[PDB]
């Protein structure tokens, strides 16, 4: 009834669309720890016993999955872990030498993808130099009959450690305390713009870091309908992402079996190559169910008519570019496949199909990751036949007729993380209160309801990779003590509802009690009061020291 | 009423725990155990506890493992900036060494060709190696160039030990034990909390501990297992014996350049006539000490005739006495000392010949090694024999395990994690053995200690301590007892947990005894207090707005 007097609130659901550091949470079980992985450390903390999710009500937030923070953070972290895993492994320094190559002639027949190359190379004994003969792919070998390695222009080659594996391990990207990841329950949401009901998670489902071009593999499945994601309908340069309604089983193989030959370069260092191939040479086939593929592609066509109307649409093979862009490039079973995806999107097919669509593929030892210069890996030849069954669960297209597009490893991380957003809980709020001195459950709910449910938010707020985890920890400590000592300078440290001895001001706002505590939300409230937070803080701590010194003087007789 | 729940923050309680540990070198800059180690505090504080008994296992100590890892870290950080002599690996023609004054059996000059700092032409380099390092193929090669590679020591840095004072991070304490007669294993009768251990020299020795700690009263022997021959036996001698070692000749030093910015140090021709390198000990002192040792072995290990025999055999680092004299490693054949019935005249010193080795493959690791630089001129060393290492077979000397070297000095200390959170019924660490009613006076003193790449390691330990303090504060806030030692009333104590009577709890037992009595159930009461604070908080919320 009297004049409005201030009250501070610790733990009200509030956020700002912010940026922060996120720390990995690798899968808990031990066999994957044994199966050493480039993508996932063992130092990465185990996943939670219960991956937890809670759903909000009456809240709508804007998501921009094109400009979201998971994508940058995952790209940087995955490059860092790549470099870390490659660092101990040998640098194949004496590889970049002239080579005498001729096409490989197996005892059965000739191979199109291979040439036997003899060259001279200096070993751990510098005096000894002798001829060394090893196989090499045609794609990786650049001509000058004398060939050299393609990436001798870019960098000295680094061998992948056969100990470590390229297999995608689910990474639970998890945020420090004081930050909460916001998911969108709307299955049909295009990923851009508002989402009508959202969910708060302490951390995300396990995301597989999977390199793929022109298609998405082992990705998430749209539960209701096939979905299109578009940065800009008008602009052609932007990228179109198809999230597929249902999986399209892709079966890939290298039919032959490969023999690993080791050559010593250093003490405890060798270069691994493929020897002679056993068995009759046969091409690498990545075949897909044809009726399924046709029905799906046509469902893409039907769904896509709405977002670009009254125009004939034809999927066309990509015109040209580097092999990572034009051809579907991905790794399964520890080897790199590059598959001509022309036949899948070829307009030659007139809708008639009865048996598996076949795609020839080629395999490359030397790969430049993330399109960077300065780095180049040597894939050791996996021994035996590999046969990997994967799910086609998404496509990458671009308008000039829509063609497949590839090479943007950032977009693979975009396609999985379309729904998650970092938000920084700024737990401090200011408002008048009835009782006047002399996780995120109640976001959209009424203000008094949040005043009751403040305890849950407080409880959750209470509680370079090693350096990254340490950074997350100390950020939690610094934020916690920042808030606690600000409360101490406000007079109610350890109390969530800090009734204050300070009057409110008409200048800050003239809103009535019913308006703020019935209709306005904490985000709307922060919008109203966000311009005057500093001044209220300073004059509140002034009021505290004034009151305390007055009480000390009155205490003194 | 009956005794009901009460928290006690900062009371003396320890569980036998493992935590991280950091170096602290000497404060003086004369030695300026590299320099990145923090300087020690002026006063290593030590406080003896009354009525407290702790079971020290000399062989299941965590700090010996942490010491091994940390000193490996020191050594690898030292070696990493230094040069890697990978190009040294060439075929090597060799020939015996004939100085102008006499001939040497131990040596050979070898001639070999490399590349200059200018990247095309070099010239013949004739440098001198021992017979122990080189391996024939009459063309020779270094000992381990195929399986491993050799990392030259930085010529500036020296390998002599500096005393490291390991200190417990905040919330953790080191517990020395002050019983003088003690065999490492089992209870020790009275103990002392120490902020940091006494400065341990990272000394490398085999069969004869050097520059170590002295037995204060009598020669004391420790056992890892009486009934089994594998497990090792420690001897820690009272008084001492001077071991006096020399390098008789003058070896030149020749700096040969490998490439631009890389140079390694060989010897070149010797000056003076070659004399066998050797080390001697006083005969009478050795005989007295060894007779005492045999008598002690008779005393503890009963009824058996005990005899000392030389080491059986193996690589020269195994059978003999390895040690770093004057920044150079030698290996002294101990056929003189431990062999009985040689019938020494006892007036002359007992003399052991020694072989100096260039390439040191220590730390029980393959794939990494050192080319110790040849120090110029004579070297003299005069050190103690403060302990011996033997095994049951007869009793024979052994070596090669640096973990045992680190075991010998740290036999007194054990780490303990102070958990301030003491939960009891109710109506620096000196008062641990005292009563709880008396020990609650001094809980503030233990509370004080909770606050007070190796930079990153000690930062991680400090952050561990910080989040430990904040875990304590977080738990007390979840219980509502935060910021204070003793709380209010009205939370009952379930009888099933413990059965002692009201009066005898305080006076009779120690805090550790109560911890053992109450250890299992702690999680249950942490839940019941948690939910109690929640429901009381709900009631207090009903009180907050009236």
């Amino acid at each position, epitope marked *: 009834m009297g004049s409005l007097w201030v009250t501070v609130y610790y733990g009200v659901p509030v956020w700002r669309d912010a940026e922060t550091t996120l720390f990995c949470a690798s899968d808990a079980k031990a066999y994957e720890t044994e199966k050493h992985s480039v993508w996932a450390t063992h130092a990465c903390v185990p996943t939670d016993p219960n991956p937890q999710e809670m759903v909000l009500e009456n809240v709508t937030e804007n998501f921009n999955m094109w400009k979201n923070d998971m994508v940058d953070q995952m790209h940087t972290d995955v490059i860092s872990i790549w470099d870390q895993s490659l660092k101990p492994c040998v640098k194949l320094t004496p590889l970049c030498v002239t080579l005498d190559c001729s096409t490989y002639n197996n005892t059965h027949n000739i191979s199109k993808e291979m040439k036997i190359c003899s060259f001279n190379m200096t070993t751990e004994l510098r005096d000894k130099k002798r001829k060394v003969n090893v196989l090499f792919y045609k794609l990786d070998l650049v001509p000058l009959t004398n060939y050299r390695l393609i990436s001798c222009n870019t960098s000295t080659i680094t061998q992948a450690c056969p100990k470590v594996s390229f297999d995608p391990i689910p990474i639970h990207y998890c945020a420090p305390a004081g930050y909460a990841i916001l998911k969108c329950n709307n299955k049909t949401f295009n990923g851009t713009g508002p989402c009508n009901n959202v969910s708060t998670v302490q951390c995300t489902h396990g995301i597989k870091p999977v390199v793929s071009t022109q298609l998405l593999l082992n990705g998430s499945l749209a539960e209701e309908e096939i979905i299109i994601r578009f940065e800009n309908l008008t602009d052609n340069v932007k990228i179109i992402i198809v999230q597929l309604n249902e999986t399209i089983n892709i079966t890939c193989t290298r039919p032959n079996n490969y023999t690993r030959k080791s050559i010593r370069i250093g003490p405890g260092q060798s270069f691994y190559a493929m020897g002679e191939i056993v068995g009759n040479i046969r091409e690498a086939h990545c075949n897909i169910s044809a009726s399924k593929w046709n029905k799906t592609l046509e469902r893409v066509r039907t769904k896509l008519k709405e977002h670009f109307p009254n125009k004939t649409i034809e999927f066309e093979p990509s015109s040209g570019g580097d092999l990572e862009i034009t051809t579907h490039s991905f790794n399964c079973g520890g080897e790199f496949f590059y598959c001509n995806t022309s036949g899948l999107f070829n307009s030659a097919i007139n809708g008639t199909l009865t048996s598996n669509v076949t795609l020839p593929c080629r395999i490359k030892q030397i790969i430049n990751m993330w399109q960077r210069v300065g780095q180049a890996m040597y894939a050791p030849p996996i021994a035996g036949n590999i046969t990997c069954k994967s799910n086609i669960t998404g496509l990458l297209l671009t308008r000039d007729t829509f063609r497949p597009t590839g090479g943007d490893m950032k977009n693979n991380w975009r396609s999985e993380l379309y729904k998650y957003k970092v938000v920084e809980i700024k737990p401090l709020g200011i408002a008048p209160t009835r009782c006047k001195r002399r996780f995120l459950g109640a976001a959209g709910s009424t203000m008094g309801a949040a005043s009751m449910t403040l305890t849950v938010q407080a409880r959750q707020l209470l509680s370079v990779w090693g350096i990254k985890q340490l950074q997350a920890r100390v950020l939690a400590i610094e934020r916690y003590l920042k808030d606690q000592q600000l409360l101490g300078l406000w007079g109610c440290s350890g109390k969530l509802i800090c009734t204050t001895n300070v009057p409110w001001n008409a200048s800050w706002s003239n809103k009535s009690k019913n308006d703020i505590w019935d209709n306005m939300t904490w985000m709307q409230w922060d919008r109203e009061i966000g311009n005057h937070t500093d001044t209220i803080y300073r004059l509140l701590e002034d009021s505290q020291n004034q009151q305390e010194k007055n009480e000390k003087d009155l205490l003194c007789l | 009423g009956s005794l009901w729940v009460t928290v006690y923050y900062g009371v003396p309680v320890w569980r036998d725990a493992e935590t991280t540990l950091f170096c602290a070198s000497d404060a003086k800059a004369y030695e300026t155990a590299t320099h990145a180690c923090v300087p020690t505090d002026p006063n290593p504080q030590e406080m003896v506890l009354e009525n407290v008994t702790e079971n020290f296992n000399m062989w299941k100590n965590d700090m010996v493992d942490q010491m091994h890892t940390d000193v490996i870290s020191i050594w690898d950080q030292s070696l990493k900036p230094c040069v890697k002599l990978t190009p040294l690996c060439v075929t090597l023609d060799c020939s015996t060494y004939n100085n102008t004054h006499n001939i040497s059996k131990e040596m050979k000059i070898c001639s070999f060709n490399m590349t200059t700092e200018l990247r095309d032409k070099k010239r013949k380099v004739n440098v001198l190696f021992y017979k122990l390092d080189l391996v024939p193929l009459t063309n020779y090669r270094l000992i381990s160039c195929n399986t491993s590679t050799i990392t030259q020591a930085c010529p500036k840095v020296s390998f002599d030990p500096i005393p490291i004072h390991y200190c417990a991070p905040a919330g953790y304490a080191i517990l020395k034990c002050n019983n003088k007669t003690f065999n490492g294993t089992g209870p020790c009768n009275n103990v002392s909390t120490v902020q940091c251990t006494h400065g341990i020299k990272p000394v490398v020795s085999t069969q004869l501990l050097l520059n170590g700690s002295l037995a204060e009263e009598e020669i004391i022997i420790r056992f890892e297992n009486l009934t089994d021959n594998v497990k090792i036996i420690i001897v820690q001698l009272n008084e001492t014996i001077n071991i006096t070692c020399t390098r008789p000749n003058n070896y030149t030093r020749k700096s040969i350049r490998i490439g631009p910015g890389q140079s390694f140090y060989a010897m070149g021709e010797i000056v003076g006539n070659i004399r066998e390198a050797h080390c001697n000990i006083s005969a009478s002192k050795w005989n007295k000490t060894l007779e005492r040792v045999r008598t002690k072995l008779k005393e503890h290990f009963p009824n058996k005739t005990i005899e000392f025999e030389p080491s059986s055999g193996g690589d020269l680092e195994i059978t003999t006495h390895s040690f770093n004299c004057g920044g150079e490693f030698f290996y002294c054949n101990t056929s003189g000392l431990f062999n009985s019935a040689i019938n020494g005249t006892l007036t002359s010193n007992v003399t052991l010949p020694c072989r100096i080795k260039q390439i040191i493959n220590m730390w*029980q690791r393959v794939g990494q090694a050192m080319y110790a630089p040849p120090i110029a001129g004579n070297i003299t060393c005069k050190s103690n024999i403060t302990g011996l290492l033997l095994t049951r077979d007869t009793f024979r000397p052994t070596g090669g395990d640096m973990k045992n070297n680190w075991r010998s000095e740290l036999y007194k200390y054990k780490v303990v994690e102070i958990k301030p959170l003491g939960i009891a019924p109710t109506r620096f660490l000196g008062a641990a053995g005292s009563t709880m009613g008396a020990a609650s006076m001094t809980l503030t003193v233990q509370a004080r200690q909770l606050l007070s790449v190796w930079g990153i390691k000690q930062l991680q330990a400090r952050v561990l301590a910080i989040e430990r303090y904040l875990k304590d504060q977080q738990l007390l806030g979840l219980w509502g007892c935060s910021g204070k030692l003793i709380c209010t009333t009205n939370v009952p104590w379930n009888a099933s947990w413990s059965n002692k009577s009201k009066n005898d709890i305080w006076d009779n037992m120690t805090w550790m005894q109560w911890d053992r009595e109450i250890g299992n159930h702690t999680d249950t009461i942490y839940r019941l207090l948690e939910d109690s604070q929640n429901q009381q908080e709900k009631n207090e919320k009903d009180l907050l707005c009236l």
Partner: antibody, heavy 120, light 106 residues
Framework: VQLQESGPGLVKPSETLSLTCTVSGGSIDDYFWNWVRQPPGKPLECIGYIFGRGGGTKYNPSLDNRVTISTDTPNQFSLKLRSVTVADTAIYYC?????????????????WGRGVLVTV | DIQMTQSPSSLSASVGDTVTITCQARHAVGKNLNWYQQKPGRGPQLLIYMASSRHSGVPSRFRGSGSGREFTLTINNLQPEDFATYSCQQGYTYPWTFGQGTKVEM
């Protein structure tokens, strides 16, 4: 890679012994090639080990002045022993020490052959 | 040459065994131990390569651990294929000796 032994079913005492091990899967690598004899209910024992194709060889002084390792063809590597004795009767095997750090299995007999029993 | 021992010399149980080993000679060889499994009348194959972690192919049931003279191998949740011999091995010097052979049955 698959490894297999080859030799005589029976030897007589005081007669020379020979054995040949075959790496079927691929050519003879640069890894360490080993013979690991298993005596009847007693610990296994090394004989002569060669670092690849025509590399240096380390033999055992426990079986002094009898062992020899030599290679003939890129898929065969052989052991030869002279002046055998009755105590040598055992099951022989061939195996491979992984000298290099990053390969799965390091300084370890990774792939062994099935082995052959010699009576002597 | 190094002498080698194992304990128990021949165990007999199904699930949860533990093969401790004392290998004597110069103790604390490092992490330079290699376990093996030899099926009856068959070639042995690798289990643990540094007393550290499992080899490729051998499951997580088989593990090796310990530094110092007290190297150890633990097998958990044994299946019928698990029952076979296991031996100590060194890595320092050229003659790598083996343990007498710890046997597990039933």
């Amino acid at each position: 890679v698959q490894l297999q032994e080859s030799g005589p079913g029976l030897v007589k005492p005081s007669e020379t012994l020979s054995l040949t091990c075959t790496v079927s899967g691929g050519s003879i690598d640069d890894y360490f090639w080993n013979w690991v004899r298993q005596p009847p209910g007693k610990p296994l024992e090394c004989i002569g080990y060669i670092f690849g194709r025509g590399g240096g060889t380390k033999y055992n002084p426990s079986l002094d002045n009898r062992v020899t390792i030599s290679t003939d063809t890129p898929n065969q590597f052989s052991l030869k022993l002279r002046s055998v004795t009755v105590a040598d009767t055992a099951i022989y095997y061939c195996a491979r020490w992984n000298l290099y750090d990053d390969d799965f299995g390091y300084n370890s007999f990774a792939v062994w052959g099935r082995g052959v029993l010699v009576t002597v | 040459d190094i002498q080698m021992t194992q304990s128990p010399s021949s165990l007999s149980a199904s699930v949860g065994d533990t093969v401790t080993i004392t290998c004597q000679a110069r103790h604390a060889v490092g992490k330079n131990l290699n376990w093996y499994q030899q099926k009856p009348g068959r070639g042995p194959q690798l289990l643990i390569y540094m007393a550290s972690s499992r080899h490729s192919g051998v499951p997580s049931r088989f593990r090796g651990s310990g530094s110092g003279r007290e190297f150890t191998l633990t097998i958990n949740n044994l299946q019928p294929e698990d029952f076979a011999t296991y031996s100590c091995q060194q890595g320092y010097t050229y003659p790598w000796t083996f343990g007498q052979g710890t046997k597990v049955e039933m």
